[PDB]
Amino acid sequence: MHIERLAVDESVGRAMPPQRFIEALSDLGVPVEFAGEDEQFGPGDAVASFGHRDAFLDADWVHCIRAGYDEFPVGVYEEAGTYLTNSTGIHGTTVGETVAGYMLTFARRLHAYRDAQHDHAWDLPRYEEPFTLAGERVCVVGLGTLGRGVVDRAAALGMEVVGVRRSGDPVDNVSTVYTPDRLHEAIADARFVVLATPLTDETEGMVAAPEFETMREDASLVNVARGPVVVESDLVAALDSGDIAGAALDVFSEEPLPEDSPLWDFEDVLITPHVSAATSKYHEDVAALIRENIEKIATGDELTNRVV
Template sequence: MPDIVVRRHSVHGMPVDQYASALRERLPDSEVAVARTPNAERDLVADATVVTGSAIDEALLDRADALRLFASTYAGYDHLPLDALRERGVALTTASGVHGPNVAEYVLGAWLSLARGFLRARRQQRERVWQAFQATDFAESRVCVVGLGAIGEAIVARLDGFGVETVAVRHSPEKGAAADEVYGYDEIHEAMADARYVALACPLTDETRGLVDESLLRTMHPETVLVNVARGPVVDTDALVDALRRNYVGGAVLDVTDPEPLPADHPLWDFENVLLTPHNAGHTPEYYERLADIVAENVRRAEENGAWDGLRNQVDL
């Protein structure tokens, strides 16, 4: 029976066989199997030490008597049965850090696209309109990053060289950051008051749900470009629509929405200063390679230490 079972759910449309191959390269002494059907999953997990995939439910956990680690292929874990994992003594790790470089590039590209008017340029190109228009400098702007996990830190790091003022919002501001200023969530209005570019890269928690509400949108500068690569519910969608209609903000780039996906008749589709992408900012052809590095490192740590604890990206259950 296999030591590691890879669930059949692909990430960003990439076949899970690539993931399994990457794990086999890094762990040649472990047997890695891909569970291609629900029945195969139920059979294979019975003796597996590690199961990896986007999710796992309690029914599958009930069959996984030897399971010691569920290695999520996502950075977020709010969708997982945390209580059930804890009760069964199963460690949980995430894909945190896998998305850092590519999501940071997405955010920088989004900010620059709106600063330089690329959305308008694309529309004029479709309409065969040759008409000059004004753009905005990104340099010397105040840029705010909310959330300083692996993605937030990667965004801040890539701002070097752009000549901007960087501010960050994090749960524990006393930890500091590479940003010029660091605020707590209770000071988020102060952090965003003069920011022209804002990125949301925080986890979805009770504290961050609805964080960007009508009040915070009113605090933002009318030219602020808001980018959300966190979770849709971090933003109050109705409040954002109202702010866009009233020109309280300059524009938005949303890789995540609430609801998700957006209904075809949702008003966000129709704003010229809004760019929507289908929750794929995290895609990179290196996804499985980076993910396999994390899982392989944790398997080796557990073998050396004799315990599934102190793992990279381990969630405290």
């Protein structure tokens, strides 16, 4: 399979300016070209894209610039003979730092202080409100690149770390790992529950009213995975009733989050606009994977992060 061109789909703009990425891929050994949204593809084309387009099935290879490839019809790629790769492996530091930032925000009450800053108010916390992450329990659901980025930072901060993954097998810096049919055992005693799984048939709606019942009333949910891993209306109901204390949410069942969502209005909810993995160097981070896979395809080696 003989790549002659890398097309950079305009949808990459949802993560990074296309020209920054195109410039990062100079010296690839094939030309790199911008592709607008209604262009055609053919043999010899590789495409780098955020979203899926059916026109891509005329190309030889699509590199999805996201870790999560849930919006791509994987079955149709195989039939068309188009390779599909993803960008898992590059988001550990960005998302790990954002999640550490969410947990420290809640522990040290930074968000409440920011609210007060708008009012020029010197509002002192109640004695019980500020706490330390050190000594507190976090459950990380999904123990891959994202989850491990969270775990390693949580462990370094002195948290007790448990988690969940498909295999249930051990992970460094996780004291106890559970399979997904022991999720309720994993989350029950945690001060924070972090979601870092792909969106699949299995994970869709994982976290719903039963899970919020099981969680501690003083616990917070962190979702940096995909919105539909949570049943969003159940999350709203749990927040309304005080079944849990709050949440840090980067992803939602409808994005952008509608202006009329109830989720904006809770003091102890942090909303971030699907930017937990944002970075001014995303173009370099993704370019490294493209260079790697170009070499693999050129030499007949197995592609890195091949989905189908």
